[PDB]
C-alpha cells in the first residue's frame, strides 16, 4: 500500500511541468525514502533525477518498493484539476494498474478524485557517480532562465566558462555573438539576487541552449539554481525542493 500526502499540491504540479516537455513517459520509483524518478530524453542527451523525500509528505507510507509508470501528459491533464493551495493525496495498491489522486480544497468542502491508468515502462537505470565538481555556481533561477532564453534567441549552443572572476555564458550565431558575465554578488538587503561562485579549477564547456531552456521550466520550484561543472562530466542544473531536489544532467556538445 502507498499513500503520500502533500500539504500543497503546487509542488507536484510544478515538478511535472518541469519534466513533461523533456521526458514524456516516466517511472516513479516509490520506496521508504520517498518518490524518485530517473529518465532520459528521447535523443538521450539529458537525464532527469528527481527525489521527493518522505519528509515533505505529511503522512508518507510506502509498504513495498513500487514503480508507477505514468504518461506525464495525462498526469498533467489530471494535475491541472488541482489548485495550487490544495491538499493532494496519492495512493496505490501493491500490484496496481492505476494510481489514485485526491484533491481536497482547504476552505470549501470540495473533494476531487481521479484514477489514472498506469503504463509499462522499461527501466533504464543509470549510475551517477559521486562527483566533486570543479565549479559550483549559485545564482537566481530567474536570472539563469533569462540568460538561457536570451541566448537561445541568438544561437543553438552556449559556452559556460567558470573562472576566478565569475561565470560567462557566451554564444555565436549568424546574427553575430553575445555574452553575459556574472560576478560574485552578495547583498544584505535584497538577497534573492545573490550569486556565489565556488571554484577549484577553471571550466569551459559547450551545451545545447534548447535543453537548458527546457531545464529552466523548473524555475517555479525555487528562487535559486545551482550549476555544477567539470571538464569531463555532464553539466548539473539543480533546483532545491526543500524536501528533495530536481536535477538535470546535460552532456556537452
Amino acid at each position: 500500500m502507498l499513500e503520500a500526502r502533500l500539504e500543497q499540491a503546487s509542488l507536484l504540479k510544478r515538478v511535472v511541468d518541469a519534466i513533461k516537455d523533456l521526458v514524456q513517459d516516466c517511472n516513479f520509483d516509490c520506496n521508504d525514502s520517498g518518490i524518485a524518478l530517473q529518465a532520459m530524453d528521447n535523443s538521450h542527451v539529458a537525464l532527469v533525477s528527481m527525489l521527493l523525500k518522505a519528509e515533505g509528505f505529511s503522512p508518507y507510507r510506502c509498504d513495498r518498493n513500487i514503480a508507477l509508470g505514468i504518461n506525464l501528459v495525462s498526469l498533467t491533464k489530471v494535475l491541472r484539476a488541482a489548485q495550487n493551495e490544495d491538499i493532494l493525496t496519492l495512493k496505490a495498491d501493491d500490484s496496481p494498474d492505476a494510481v489514485n489522486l485526491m484533491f481536497e480544497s482547504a476552505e470549501t468542502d470540495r473533494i476531487s478524485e481521479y484514477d489514472i491508468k498506469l503504463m509499462d515502462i522499461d527501466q533504464e537505470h543509470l549510475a551517477i557517480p559521486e562527483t566533486e565538481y570543479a565549479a559550483t555556481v549559485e545564482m537566481p533561477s530567474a536570472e539563469f532562465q533569462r540568460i538561457c532564453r536570451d541566448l537561445n534567441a541568438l544561437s543553438e549552443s552556449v559556452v559556460i566558462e567558470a573562472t576566478k572572476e565569475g561565470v560567462k555564458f557566451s554564444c555565436q550565431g549568424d546574427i553575430g555573438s553575445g555574452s553575459v558575465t556574472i560576478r560574485q554578488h552578495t547583498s544584505v538587503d535584497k538577497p534573492e539576487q545573490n550569486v556565489s561562485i565556488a571554484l577549484s579549477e577553471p571550466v569551459a564547456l559547450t551545451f545545447s541552449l534548447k535543453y537548458l531552456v527546457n531545464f529552466c521550466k523548473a524555475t517555479s520550484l525555487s528562487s535559486k539554481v545551482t550549476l555544477c561543472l567539470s571538464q569531463e562530466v555532464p553539466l548539473l542544473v539543480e533546483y532545491g525542493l526543500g524536501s528533495g531536489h530536481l536535477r538535470f544532467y546535460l552532456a556537452p556538445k
Binding site: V45, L47, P234, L250, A251
Partner: peptide, 9 residues
C-alpha cells in the same frame, strides 16, 4: 552527445 558515455548502465 549521448548521455550514457558518462553514466554506466
Amino acid at each position: 552527445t549521448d548521455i550514457r558515455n558518462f553514466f554506466h548502465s
